[PDB]
């Protein structure tokens, strides 16, 4: 429909999740989460109607070295399939070069998730040993962070990870978490702190974040390069942050019921 | 002894019991809304008890396994002493009445047919006489048991096709039935209770409809363990709410007042 903004997003708790009973629901009402609420807020402030669509290949966005084709939500923006991406999408240099980003709406860093009791306290710890395997999501800013790093500990970790057998890489966050939970403390998962903290507060309460974050960065709302929508969306993010509304949303979707 | 909090077993089935929008930050009864949620509040008020709403663990209404003879679902919760009362769209049936107490019905209904708009079917007879349009029911519950037990030729004929169709024509939840009708381009019809049918008919994208008359006539009742002293009070409360017109007000509130398909 004319004037309808196509929003690309991704299923990632608690950002975007299928509602209970979603099978009888339709359109935007199928989904719930932090980014679903944020999308509604941004839309309201900028005065547009929008349609949420889950990205086809289920990926965030990387560029194939061979074909130099972008995939994921980044791909959707770059090739004109979506008008805006509203998701836990990390602002990185290589992405900033091909799409526009708002100022960040949330902060985060790469962190370590272990099964409770695992004798690891830091990235350094992981790097100095081999009994406990560790990996990341097979595509995204986290894996790219280790692949590009010239920092000693991270470089070591990467040279280990890219070769380890069987693969320490997983296809989804849920899959990474599952692997931590099944491996009796022999697998540690490298993921962004926001997801780590969410999962930490959920049953069966057998995982935990250890150490400080390995880096500091932010999620931004992304639009195609030079899109006129960019300006309004950026001012809207800043406005919502200043009203304390971004904080309210974090507190709502990371609200601790006491499962753990 | 002293008064205890009443444990209410119920089930997530729209618009009887639904998650409230901000459920993620709410606790206890406050997480839920809908017809049965309001009904529980009214019943508790007139009866003078405090209560806790609990969603049934296995997500079933109640059936007895032929093998083990164990009751599952909300009926099971009551039978095995896990809950004190069930407040849900629970169909009053012979096999259940044998093992639990039921109030007089708070709502009437009948098994019905839901089609995607434009499907060339207007009756169960129509369905039975063709094969192009598949049809099914929820894989457990009073609707499936109706066909499985029917001695009436048309329904026996529908059951004979349904039990052996492939892929399976049964669905696990009402939502799954609705999705199957909506996505199958007129090649799937869903057999469900007229109450759910009339509700979905008023929801976006307004692409379904109830066709034909009802296949039977029955009621939903409040259930309690057999012999429970709570039964008497709750029954009278249901009768009172009906005669005051409160039950009619509630159905209009949840079915029609905020229907999404026009006026
Ligand atoms: N924010 C990341 C991204 O933009 O690529 C996502 C979250 C999983 C994935 C990752 O951590 O690599
Ligand atoms: N009222 C029914 C019951 O008590 O079993 C429920 C509603 C879905 C299921 C059905 O239609 O069979
Ligand atoms: Cl669901
Ligand atoms: Cl108590
Ligand atoms: Cl009625």
Swiss-Prot record, chain A:
It comes from the Eukaryota. Changing residue 93 to Y: Promotes dimerization. Strongly reduced desensitization. Induction: Down-regulated in the pyramidal cell layer of CA1 in the hippocampus by global ischemia. L-glutamate binds at residues 88, 90, 95, 141-142, 192. It is found in: Cell membrane; Postsynaptic cell membrane; Postsynaptic density membrane. Detected in forebrain. Detected in dendrites of neuronal cells. Expressed in the pyramidal cell layers of CA1 and CA3 and in the granule cell layer of the dentate gyrus. Disulfide bonds join 205-260. Residues 119-260 are extracellular. The postsynaptic actions of L-glutamate are mediated by a variety of receptors that are named according to their selective agonists. This receptor binds AMPA (quisqualate) > L-glutamate > kainate. This is Glutamate receptor 2. It comes from Rattus norvegicus. The chain holds residues 413 to 794 of 883 of the full protein.
Curated annotation (Swiss-Prot), chain B:
Glycans are attached at residue 3. L-glutamate binds at residues 89, 91, 96, 142-143, 193. Detected in forebrain. Detected in dendrites of neuronal cells. Expressed in the pyramidal cell layers of CA1 and CA3 and in the granule cell layer of the dentate gyrus. Induction: Down-regulated in the pyramidal cell layer of CA1 in the hippocampus by global ischemia. It comes from the Eukaryota. The modification Phosphoserine is found at residues 150, 184. The record marks 64, 148, 240 as: Interaction with the cone snail toxin Con-ikot-ikot. Palmitoylated. Depalmitoylated upon L-glutamate stimulation. Ionotropic glutamate receptor that functions as a ligand-gated cation channel, gated by L-glutamate and glutamatergic agonists such as alpha-amino-3-hydroxy-5-methyl-4-isoxazolepropionic acid (AMPA), quisqualic acid, and kainic acid. L-glutamate acts as an excitatory neurotransmitter at many synapses in the central nervous system and plays an important role in fast excitatory synaptic transmission. This is Glutamate receptor 2. It comes from Rattus norvegicus (Rat). The gene is Gria2. The chain holds residues 413 to 796 of 883 of the full protein.
